[PDB]
């Protein structure tokens, strides 16, 4: 048996008026413990490959496997140029004395998505590629 890394809720919306992709990070659930104490200090990292210098982060939530994020993030790119891009939503356990530990991620290849209407999804977290 593989255990699940965690369930993540998020939203995609293309804002045609402002010309931006809106990524909303709503919450996570049943995240994995990456501290010995049996909890984590989760935060999500969000960016739009192949561009990796434009990287956002959520606030860190001390000690919880069911964080409520509630943050929205913007990427200025035209609906047409959104093609070959993949959206990465990377959950991490903040460790103050060392590398922060990867919990898991969701990668959304933007080519495959319907974005006429807005979208709200839950996705299982997968290990890094
Ligand atoms: Ca840790
Ligand atoms: Ca930690
Ligand atoms: Ca660590």
From Swiss-Prot:
Q: Which residues bind Ca(2+) 2?
A: 34-35, 93, 95, 101
Which positions are annotated as binding Ca(2+) 3? 95, 98, 101
The text of the family note is: Belongs to the synaptotagmin family.
Residues the record lists as binding Ca(2+) 1: 35, 41, 93-95
Give the source's domain of life in one word.
Answer: Eukaryota
Q: What is this protein called?
A: Synaptotagmin-5
Domain (C2) ranges: 4-123
Which purpose does this protein serve, as stated in its record?
May be involved in Ca(2+)-dependent exocytosis of secretory vesicles through Ca(2+) and phospholipid binding to the C2 domain or may serve as Ca(2+) sensors in the process of vesicular trafficking and exocytosis. Regulates the Ca(2+)-dependent secretion of norepinephrine in PC12 cells. Required for export from the endocytic recycling compartment to the cell surface.
**Whole protein: which stretch is covered?**
105 to 233 of 386
Tell me where in or outside the cell this protein is found: Cytoplasmic vesicle, Secretory vesicle, Synaptic vesicle membrane; Recycling endosome membrane
Instruction: Fill in the subunit field for this protein.
Output: Homodimer. Interacts with both alpha- and beta-tubulin.
């Amino acid at each position: 048996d593989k255990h699940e890394l965690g369930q993540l809720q998020y939203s995609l919306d293309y804002d045609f008026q402002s010309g931006q992709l809106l990524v909303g990070i709503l919450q996570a659930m049943g995240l994995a413990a990456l501290d010995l104490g049996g909890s984590s200090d989760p935060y999500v990292r969000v960016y739009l490959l192949p561009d990796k210098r434009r990287r956002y982060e959520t606030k860190v939530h001390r000690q919880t496997l069911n964080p409520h994020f509630g943050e929205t993030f913007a990427f200025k790119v035209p609906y047409v140029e959104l093609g070959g891009r993949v959206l990465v939503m990377a959950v991490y356990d903040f460790d103050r004395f060392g590398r922060n530990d990867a919990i898991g991620e969701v990668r959304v290849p933007m080519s495959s998505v319907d974005l006429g209407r807005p979208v709200q999804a839950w996705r299982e977290l997968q290990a890094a590629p």
